[PDB]
């Protein structure tokens, strides 16, 4: 049970409490609760790649203090 940063284009930064076994679906579920962004509008980027919904976080070696990037779809 650690934390990660999620930055966006303009420079606003989202902090999340997370667990390694969290699917991507679950990370997206936490972003909406905090920031009101529908999960079907989200794209999460780590180390240049798009993260896939039913994979975990311990699949992308995502560590504490990891910084991901949100890249949003239009509704």
Smaller CB separation from another protein, 50 or 61: 50
The string of DSSP codes covering 23-54 is -HHHHHHHHHHHH---GGG--EEETTEEPPTT
DSSP state of 22: -
Instruction: Choose one: 5-13, 17-25, 26-34, 57-65; the region binding another protein (CB under 8 A).
Output: 5-13
50 phi/psi in degrees, rounded to 5: -85, 130
Site for another protein (CB under 8 A): which residue of 3, 50, 58, 63?
A: 50
Q: Please answer whether residues 62 and 2 qualify as being in contact, where contact means their C-beta atoms are separated by less than 8 angstroms.
A: no
Site for another protein (CB under 8 A): which residue of 40, 49, 54, 65?
A: 49
Site for another protein (CB under 8 A): which residue of 1, 11, 33, 65?
A: 11
12 binds another protein (CB under 8 A): yes
Strand partners for 45: 50, 69
Q: Where on the chain is the footprint of another protein (CB under 8 A)?
A: 9-12, 43, 45, 48-50, 69, 71-75
């Amino acid at each position: 049970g650690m934390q990660i940063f999620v930055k966006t284009l303009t420079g606003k930064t989202i902090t999340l409490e997370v667990e390694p076994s969290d699917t991507i679906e679950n990370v997206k579920a936490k972003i909406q609760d905090k920031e009101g962004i529908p999960p079907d509008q989200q794209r999460l980027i780590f180390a240049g790649k798009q993260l896939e919904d039913g994979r975990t976080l311990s699949d992308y070696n995502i560590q504490k203090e990891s910084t991901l990037h949100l890249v949003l779809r239009l509704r």
